[PDB]
């Protein structure tokens, strides 16, 4: 068959503003341990009956060896409302006569919690887990390479 | 090594070739006359050894002894999370250096890691005079542990703390970060015990494990060595009574916790102690759903007793709530069955959950929390409310926990569709009274009050939105009117746009007069409103202009398909748009003949709409995960769909590890 | 800890402050022009470092991260099973003290644990005039480990299985078991690294872990990454990328086996190291079975087009053959299907299995066994021949394995009930060729010649006898009649007892004179002499004279049924062959109309002579276990019971735990 040997990639944390979508800076990260996990359970809506059972989709991700994460290149007091933005993702693949499937994630929050380790420095390689958010629009897209 | 002392206090000997002193010692405890042979000076030393072996639970005599009700009781304000009482302890005037030792551990649990480095340094600078150096040594460990927490929180705050907070959050002064780096330079934590005096190293060889950075390895290998006994317990494995297995795994956890929290050791807040609690409690639950559904016979009863269910109590709830993340509980809820595990001490759990509620109300309803305390606390507060599906709560207790889940939890840790999940979970044994309904009703009005701005969108991670709060009230009270969402419904004009779309999705909550003022202001004009007006009960049959919009929508979705596959941009839906249309055509809810002209863009469409010409190799058997009782009835009923699924479903039972396929293969298709 | 050396062959900067000395070195590898500008003494030192990091598999830094697919080679005669070259290395009189160190390892692998202890004792006396002191440390370790191996064996040759197995007493004399113990008191194993100089404690610090009884605790704890891979399977949608935690487990197994064998360390014989290999290999077969049956993926196709998959090779075979029991392989064969993992390198696996034959042959054809070597070789030999279901063999090699198994294997552990299983399993990949018939055909002559004594019988742990061998000849060679077994048959005396019925248990292998003359001894007497005819005789003919005795047997049972009905307790007979008689009526061998008029017997009789009018409320569900595949195939034609045996499986599949009932319905009834 076609020489599909592609395993690892390089993922691009893009940039959006607090109420805007600026994309100008970037905060991209290297290889992804990549527990990409689609626990989709999204459901059809019936016409006559209704149900409140568990029916929804979700996409979790994680990455490894983050870089480019300082200033995007003191009131120590946390508040309950947040207007933090959501950096869009790109994942650039390789290893084919076609170009990368170029999987884009449109709106993405950042869900990692901190953790203190006995040894030193909390990990040999850090991780940022990242869920995928939606309000009235698409959650992912695959830009198959085709030529080149 | 002259006596094995076990987790129950039982005493068996090894390498004691001589006189049996600890074999003999409890005979002085038994007969009051034999201990009367002691001198009136050494009787005072038996007045002290009796106390120490009682309260440390080695009152169990030897192997020549019966059963023991091995209780556990942890007298520490930090374990139970008594945050106000810990604050009132620090502000008191210090008397003892063993009170400064306990203040130093409370100011770290409360987040004050600078004040806690300082009081550890003060003890070390004036507790070398004392004739026993356990306070010197244990503070010299804790300070390096409090160093490491500061040192890699400033690494977090400058890195991944940037893009998760929206601020910078440096809580330590740059003069503070430089002082602690030049004091703690060339400190070797592995070499501290050899730095101690000679008399200390013979009287305290049991504190040498606290300065090796890998100290529960002697317990983690035993946890593994008792895991593969469960992995080798498939062909009617024994030792499921647990008097030599479960109690061993559990009483070695309760002795480690009571060592680390009574002796105020800061090594308890790290990931390596957090993982030991995760591995031990997940192993007791894995031997509670597996090794519950075993071959139940009379031959296994005569082999061994104690085949009752597992029992969780107050201390087991705190240990899962503190030491697990949400995903680590989410493994267990899909692995094991926690509804099969009974919870005891329901009224002590409702004083741990309510103190978690009031550490979130009385610390976010003010101007804010401490960020270093937020990092420690908020994982515990999330998992405690998540795992409160399993306890029953009072009406005054449920009201305070819900008002902190819905109002004062920060939005960055719990978005609108994860607050909904943890609200639906608190009903499964605590069905909503009228006093809790008026809290959800008061949260729907704060979401109304935020769509006054035009550019605002409820972000959700699972796509459950503010509608589901509405459908949750109506599920418990079928005749309900929000008499305050009506008063904003009957004050609507056309300038507000996002208001109208929000309150329309909460339409059954509105009163019958107040509906029509918004029914007159919103016409169905897009496939979103076609589906939003289905999920509120507005539409019961498609007036065929409704059937036109689906035809209108796919015509757009047809023509982009050619000019996207030449580009290769292969789209992925956000929601079950196209798949629901085929259910509308397979259940004959749409009778349009133009529906067949769109066969070939989506395989879930192509199953329902062309139920023969599909060739079935594109069937994804996770599609039966999300079908109702109704639809699977007609899947059996379709003369073509009845049997290809049976070959698909059988190999999803022969090969997979989910029980839902086993339910589908009998209940609908037999 | 200035650099973090990963297992894949990469380097990460870890705590290097100043000049990165490992960055420049790999540059000096890649740039040959830069390699030139050195001195003429630090150039010969570079050839030493280049040959080090290329045999230890440290390729490069991680910053460029070259695509690596490195393999494993274990340069050791002891790993591969070369027992003959080890022996002609012991006889070759050594020249060097790091060559006596290799023999005392090779003696220990051969079970010469007395000459191992002494030769390690010469190396301890003779390593005074040596600079490094490495052979001093690794010989104290190995002699202590060879001391621990003796002190166990004194508790097994005199302990559990001591009875009559040949050399039933000890192999170590009283003068030696006292000489070792008086030398080994107060050898603190923990005080061995500390006693060595501070030059040994810095130039050779990496051998600190071998001086601990608790060694490989630091690798059992890190194998808790098994939880990280139960977590990805339980989360059920987790698509780990790159060097996943599977490949870390495999590359860390390989890096432990290659260390301990090539450094000639005796801890590789202990149970701690075997359980590490079991738990790590079992996990990798589990992640292979999970991946080959993952539920596709709707969206992950952007990366999940295919996966190459865990496949077996030669070193993965020797590790399952050496380190598992038959009880452990059967746990993997219950959970996984190893006939779907491809087994590579099948010219090296044949040479490892031919060697195990040539060690069984050269030890139990001669009377020179070593009772320590037999204790530890026999588990590997049993596991390697059991796990060769999956490797294709050449007809020379399949001969030397089957010959060594049937004739030359010791009877004390692998009886004929298990010799049948482990020759049945070799027929899976290899259809039974012409030569292996002759190797069995020699054996059934020899099994005849041991049945002339009246007091001999074939003990079977399963119950399978030599009767089942003979089917397997006829199962493949449909036209084969053993000539010498016919030659045995023409020389019989009717006064024989064991020889007679034995040939009846191989009667379908005989010639038309040998069948007839043995039929001359075949004389049926009654019903008790008839129902064992399908068990033993196998005439395969139902004459009406035999069918008249069946009607006469139920008629005399009906006369006894009048007494059983008048007494009030109509219990069935002890020789309840009425339950069997309905099956022969169901499979159309008896065509009498009086079979349906014989009601009042056991309900299995009425179940098959009248499947319509049977009380399915009076059906007993446990009957389905005892029903063969011809019946369970033939019930599906009987539609007058098809709709109700599905009603009693479904009344148990959710309800019981016996998965045979599921396998009845999911293989047949659906």
mmCIF file of N, CA and C in Angstrom, chain B residues 311-387:
data_model
loop_
_atom_site.group_PDB
_atom_site.id
_atom_site.type_symbol
_atom_site.label_atom_id
_atom_site.label_comp_id
_atom_site.label_asym_id
_atom_site.label_seq_id
_atom_site.Cartn_x
_atom_site.Cartn_y
_atom_site.Cartn_z
ATOM 1 N N UNK B 311 -17.083 -1.171 51.552
ATOM 2 C CA UNK B 311 -17.692 -0.137 52.367
ATOM 3 C C UNK B 311 -16.787 1.080 52.326
ATOM 4 N N UNK B 312 -17.298 2.211 51.854
ATOM 5 C CA UNK B 312 -16.583 3.469 51.980
ATOM 6 C C UNK B 312 -17.130 4.302 53.134
ATOM 7 N N UNK B 313 -16.240 4.996 53.809
ATOM 8 C CA UNK B 313 -16.542 5.768 54.994
ATOM 9 C C UNK B 313 -16.040 7.189 54.783
ATOM 10 N N UNK B 314 -15.971 7.958 55.865
ATOM 11 C CA UNK B 314 -15.543 9.352 55.776
ATOM 12 C C UNK B 314 -14.119 9.500 55.277
ATOM 13 N N UNK B 315 -13.214 8.680 55.748
ATOM 14 C CA UNK B 315 -11.833 8.868 55.364
ATOM 15 C C UNK B 315 -11.574 8.429 53.948
ATOM 16 N N UNK B 316 -12.316 7.463 53.451
ATOM 17 C CA UNK B 316 -12.176 7.066 52.072
ATOM 18 C C UNK B 316 -12.747 8.075 51.099
ATOM 19 N N UNK B 317 -13.712 8.884 51.511
ATOM 20 C CA UNK B 317 -14.203 9.933 50.637
ATOM 21 C C UNK B 317 -13.205 11.063 50.521
ATOM 22 N N UNK B 318 -12.506 11.398 51.606
ATOM 23 C CA UNK B 318 -11.526 12.470 51.575
ATOM 24 C C UNK B 318 -10.332 12.076 50.740
ATOM 25 N N UNK B 319 -9.986 10.808 50.727
ATOM 26 C CA UNK B 319 -8.797 10.396 50.021
ATOM 27 C C UNK B 319 -9.003 10.342 48.520
ATOM 28 N N UNK B 320 -10.212 10.054 48.063
ATOM 29 C CA UNK B 320 -10.487 10.112 46.644
ATOM 30 C C UNK B 320 -10.674 11.552 46.218
ATOM 31 N N UNK B 321 -11.240 12.371 47.092
ATOM 32 C CA UNK B 321 -11.516 13.754 46.753
ATOM 33 C C UNK B 321 -10.248 14.572 46.679
ATOM 34 N N UNK B 322 -9.243 14.217 47.452
ATOM 35 C CA UNK B 322 -8.051 15.044 47.433
ATOM 36 C C UNK B 322 -7.055 14.556 46.405
ATOM 37 N N UNK B 323 -6.888 13.260 46.281
ATOM 38 C CA UNK B 323 -5.738 12.711 45.606
ATOM 39 C C UNK B 323 -6.012 12.302 44.188
ATOM 40 N N UNK B 324 -7.248 12.384 43.740
ATOM 41 C CA UNK B 324 -7.579 12.070 42.370
ATOM 42 C C UNK B 324 -7.782 13.359 41.593
ATOM 43 N N UNK B 325 -7.489 13.305 40.314
ATOM 44 C CA UNK B 325 -7.984 14.298 39.387
ATOM 45 C C UNK B 325 -9.331 13.827 38.889
ATOM 46 N N UNK B 326 -9.916 14.583 37.974
ATOM 47 C CA UNK B 326 -11.247 14.238 37.510
ATOM 48 C C UNK B 326 -11.173 13.068 36.552
ATOM 49 N N UNK B 327 -10.098 12.999 35.766
ATOM 50 C CA UNK B 327 -9.951 11.915 34.814
ATOM 51 C C UNK B 327 -9.708 10.597 35.517
ATOM 52 N N UNK B 328 -9.009 10.628 36.645
ATOM 53 C CA UNK B 328 -8.746 9.419 37.408
ATOM 54 C C UNK B 328 -9.992 8.872 38.079
ATOM 55 N N UNK B 329 -10.981 9.718 38.356
ATOM 56 C CA UNK B 329 -12.280 9.220 38.789
ATOM 57 C C UNK B 329 -13.080 8.777 37.584
ATOM 58 N N UNK B 330 -12.918 9.475 36.462
ATOM 59 C CA UNK B 330 -13.615 9.107 35.238
ATOM 60 C C UNK B 330 -13.159 7.772 34.677
ATOM 61 N N UNK B 331 -11.946 7.324 35.006
ATOM 62 C CA UNK B 331 -11.590 5.942 34.712
ATOM 63 C C UNK B 331 -12.407 4.977 35.539
ATOM 64 N N UNK B 332 -12.561 5.255 36.829
ATOM 65 C CA UNK B 332 -13.201 4.294 37.706
ATOM 66 C C UNK B 332 -14.688 4.196 37.445
ATOM 67 N N UNK B 333 -15.309 5.276 36.997
ATOM 68 C CA UNK B 333 -16.743 5.238 36.779
ATOM 69 C C UNK B 333 -17.086 4.456 35.528
ATOM 70 N N UNK B 334 -16.156 4.363 34.585
ATOM 71 C CA UNK B 334 -16.365 3.514 33.436
ATOM 72 C C UNK B 334 -15.715 2.154 33.594
ATOM 73 N N UNK B 335 -14.784 1.996 34.527
ATOM 74 C CA UNK B 335 -14.321 0.657 34.854
ATOM 75 C C UNK B 335 -15.260 -0.014 35.837
ATOM 76 N N UNK B 336 -15.287 0.483 37.054
ATOM 77 C CA UNK B 336 -15.925 -0.212 38.148
ATOM 78 C C UNK B 336 -17.359 0.282 38.264
ATOM 79 N N UNK B 337 -18.048 -0.096 39.333
ATOM 80 C CA UNK B 337 -19.426 0.330 39.572
ATOM 81 C C UNK B 337 -19.503 0.922 40.972
ATOM 82 N N UNK B 338 -19.580 2.250 41.050
ATOM 83 C CA UNK B 338 -19.507 2.906 42.338
ATOM 84 C C UNK B 338 -20.889 2.999 42.937
ATOM 85 N N UNK B 339 -21.920 2.829 42.115
ATOM 86 C CA UNK B 339 -23.264 2.704 42.649
ATOM 87 C C UNK B 339 -23.447 1.386 43.381
ATOM 88 N N UNK B 340 -22.564 0.423 43.137
ATOM 89 C CA UNK B 340 -22.530 -0.826 43.870
ATOM 90 C C UNK B 340 -21.772 -0.726 45.186
ATOM 91 N N UNK B 341 -20.995 0.327 45.399
ATOM 92 C CA UNK B 341 -20.275 0.522 46.648
ATOM 93 C C UNK B 341 -21.088 1.457 47.537
ATOM 94 N N UNK B 342 -21.549 0.944 48.674
ATOM 95 C CA UNK B 342 -22.315 1.738 49.627
ATOM 96 C C UNK B 342 -21.415 2.725 50.342
ATOM 97 N N UNK B 343 -21.934 3.909 50.650
ATOM 98 C CA UNK B 343 -21.144 4.880 51.398
ATOM 99 C C UNK B 343 -21.699 5.004 52.795
ATOM 100 N N UNK B 344 -20.837 4.903 53.769
ATOM 101 C CA UNK B 344 -21.228 5.152 55.135
ATOM 102 C C UNK B 344 -20.805 6.513 55.593
ATOM 103 N N UNK B 345 -21.302 6.887 56.771
ATOM 104 C CA UNK B 345 -21.013 8.155 57.430
ATOM 105 C C UNK B 345 -21.384 9.335 56.538
ATOM 106 N N UNK B 346 -22.654 9.330 56.134
ATOM 107 C CA UNK B 346 -23.231 10.321 55.245
ATOM 108 C C UNK B 346 -23.229 11.704 55.856
ATOM 109 N N UNK B 347 -23.343 11.807 57.172
ATOM 110 C CA UNK B 347 -23.418 13.106 57.811
ATOM 111 C C UNK B 347 -22.058 13.704 58.112
ATOM 112 N N UNK B 348 -20.988 12.942 57.961
ATOM 113 C CA UNK B 348 -19.666 13.525 58.042
ATOM 114 C C UNK B 348 -19.172 13.968 56.687
ATOM 115 N N UNK B 349 -19.669 13.352 55.622
ATOM 116 C CA UNK B 349 -19.333 13.798 54.285
ATOM 117 C C UNK B 349 -20.021 15.110 53.982
ATOM 118 N N UNK B 350 -21.224 15.309 54.500
ATOM 119 C CA UNK B 350 -21.885 16.592 54.344
ATOM 120 C C UNK B 350 -21.362 17.662 55.282
ATOM 121 N N UNK B 351 -20.268 17.439 55.987
ATOM 122 C CA UNK B 351 -19.565 18.520 56.643
ATOM 123 C C UNK B 351 -18.208 18.760 56.018
ATOM 124 N N UNK B 352 -17.789 17.881 55.113
ATOM 125 C CA UNK B 352 -16.604 18.098 54.300
ATOM 126 C C UNK B 352 -16.972 18.756 52.985
ATOM 127 N N UNK B 353 -18.160 18.458 52.475
ATOM 128 C CA UNK B 353 -18.615 19.061 51.235
ATOM 129 C C UNK B 353 -19.120 20.463 51.465
ATOM 130 N N UNK B 354 -19.607 20.737 52.659
ATOM 131 C CA UNK B 354 -20.132 22.053 52.950
ATOM 132 C C UNK B 354 -19.007 23.001 53.306
ATOM 133 N N UNK B 355 -17.976 22.513 53.980
ATOM 134 C CA UNK B 355 -16.781 23.316 54.145
ATOM 135 C C UNK B 355 -16.034 23.596 52.862
ATOM 136 N N UNK B 356 -16.136 22.717 51.876
ATOM 137 C CA UNK B 356 -15.644 23.008 50.541
ATOM 138 C C UNK B 356 -16.508 24.032 49.837
ATOM 139 N N UNK B 357 -17.813 23.988 50.052
ATOM 140 C CA UNK B 357 -18.688 25.038 49.563
ATOM 141 C C UNK B 357 -18.381 26.381 50.208
ATOM 142 N N UNK B 358 -18.195 26.433 51.522
ATOM 143 C CA UNK B 358 -17.922 27.725 52.134
ATOM 144 C C UNK B 358 -16.479 28.181 52.011
ATOM 145 N N UNK B 359 -15.559 27.353 51.539
ATOM 146 C CA UNK B 359 -14.249 27.867 51.171
ATOM 147 C C UNK B 359 -14.229 28.371 49.742
ATOM 148 N N UNK B 360 -15.334 28.228 49.019
ATOM 149 C CA UNK B 360 -15.484 28.760 47.678
ATOM 150 C C UNK B 360 -16.442 29.941 47.649
ATOM 151 N N UNK B 361 -17.519 29.887 48.427
ATOM 152 C CA UNK B 361 -18.339 31.073 48.592
ATOM 153 C C UNK B 361 -17.580 32.161 49.333
ATOM 154 N N UNK B 362 -17.075 31.872 50.526
ATOM 155 C CA UNK B 362 -16.469 32.906 51.353
ATOM 156 C C UNK B 362 -15.055 33.239 50.948
ATOM 157 N N UNK B 363 -14.643 32.869 49.749
ATOM 158 C CA UNK B 363 -13.328 33.238 49.265
ATOM 159 C C UNK B 363 -13.346 33.705 47.819
ATOM 160 N N UNK B 364 -14.406 33.430 47.044
ATOM 161 C CA UNK B 364 -14.641 34.046 45.741
ATOM 162 C C UNK B 364 -15.735 35.100 45.728
ATOM 163 N N UNK B 365 -16.686 35.079 46.669
ATOM 164 C CA UNK B 365 -17.652 36.173 46.753
ATOM 165 C C UNK B 365 -17.024 37.441 47.286
ATOM 166 N N UNK B 366 -15.881 37.326 47.948
ATOM 167 C CA UNK B 366 -15.028 38.458 48.248
ATOM 168 C C UNK B 366 -14.257 38.817 46.993
ATOM 169 N N UNK B 367 -13.200 39.601 47.123
ATOM 170 C CA UNK B 367 -12.557 40.081 45.910
ATOM 171 C C UNK B 367 -11.664 39.007 45.284
ATOM 172 N N UNK B 368 -11.325 37.956 46.018
ATOM 173 C CA UNK B 368 -10.706 36.803 45.386
ATOM 174 C C UNK B 368 -9.966 35.912 46.363
ATOM 175 N N UNK B 369 -9.398 34.834 45.810
ATOM 176 C CA UNK B 369 -8.603 33.878 46.568
ATOM 177 C C UNK B 369 -7.127 34.226 46.512
ATOM 178 N N UNK B 370 -6.328 33.408 47.179
ATOM 179 C CA UNK B 370 -4.902 33.395 46.935
ATOM 180 C C UNK B 370 -4.623 32.429 45.804
ATOM 181 N N UNK B 371 -3.664 32.775 44.954
ATOM 182 C CA UNK B 371 -3.443 31.971 43.759
ATOM 183 C C UNK B 371 -2.661 30.714 44.089
ATOM 184 N N UNK B 372 -1.741 30.805 45.042
ATOM 185 C CA UNK B 372 -0.979 29.641 45.451
ATOM 186 C C UNK B 372 -1.871 28.687 46.218
ATOM 187 N N UNK B 373 -2.886 29.205 46.883
ATOM 188 C CA UNK B 373 -3.849 28.339 47.525
ATOM 189 C C UNK B 373 -4.838 27.803 46.532
ATOM 190 N N UNK B 374 -5.100 28.557 45.475
ATOM 191 C CA UNK B 374 -5.989 28.104 44.421
ATOM 192 C C UNK B 374 -5.427 26.900 43.702
ATOM 193 N N UNK B 375 -4.118 26.867 43.518
ATOM 194 C CA UNK B 375 -3.472 25.770 42.822
ATOM 195 C C UNK B 375 -3.625 24.465 43.581
ATOM 196 N N UNK B 376 -3.466 24.508 44.896
ATOM 197 C CA UNK B 376 -3.656 23.339 45.739
ATOM 198 C C UNK B 376 -5.118 22.951 45.888
ATOM 199 N N UNK B 377 -5.970 23.923 46.183
ATOM 200 C CA UNK B 377 -7.325 23.639 46.613
ATOM 201 C C UNK B 377 -8.231 23.193 45.490
ATOM 202 N N UNK B 378 -8.082 23.737 44.281
ATOM 203 C CA UNK B 378 -9.197 23.648 43.340
ATOM 204 C C UNK B 378 -9.333 22.277 42.707
ATOM 205 N N UNK B 379 -8.304 21.451 42.753
ATOM 206 C CA UNK B 379 -8.464 20.088 42.302
ATOM 207 C C UNK B 379 -9.296 19.275 43.269
ATOM 208 N N UNK B 380 -9.163 19.542 44.560
ATOM 209 C CA UNK B 380 -9.915 18.908 45.628
ATOM 210 C C UNK B 380 -11.362 19.334 45.631
ATOM 211 N N UNK B 381 -11.627 20.585 45.303
ATOM 212 C CA UNK B 381 -12.987 21.058 45.327
ATOM 213 C C UNK B 381 -13.763 20.580 44.126
ATOM 214 N N UNK B 382 -13.092 20.390 43.007
ATOM 215 C CA UNK B 382 -13.721 19.826 41.837
ATOM 216 C C UNK B 382 -14.087 18.370 42.042
ATOM 217 N N UNK B 383 -13.155 17.569 42.552
ATOM 218 C CA UNK B 383 -13.391 16.143 42.695
ATOM 219 C C UNK B 383 -14.326 15.810 43.835
ATOM 220 N N UNK B 384 -14.424 16.666 44.835
ATOM 221 C CA UNK B 384 -15.358 16.418 45.912
ATOM 222 C C UNK B 384 -16.789 16.609 45.483
ATOM 223 N N UNK B 385 -17.066 17.598 44.650
ATOM 224 C CA UNK B 385 -18.423 17.818 44.191
ATOM 225 C C UNK B 385 -18.801 16.867 43.078
ATOM 226 N N UNK B 386 -17.816 16.343 42.379
ATOM 227 C CA UNK B 386 -18.025 15.405 41.301
ATOM 228 C C UNK B 386 -18.358 14.031 41.832
ATOM 229 N N UNK B 387 -17.788 13.681 42.964
ATOM 230 C CA UNK B 387 -17.935 12.382 43.575
ATOM 231 C C UNK B 387 -18.991 12.406 44.656
#
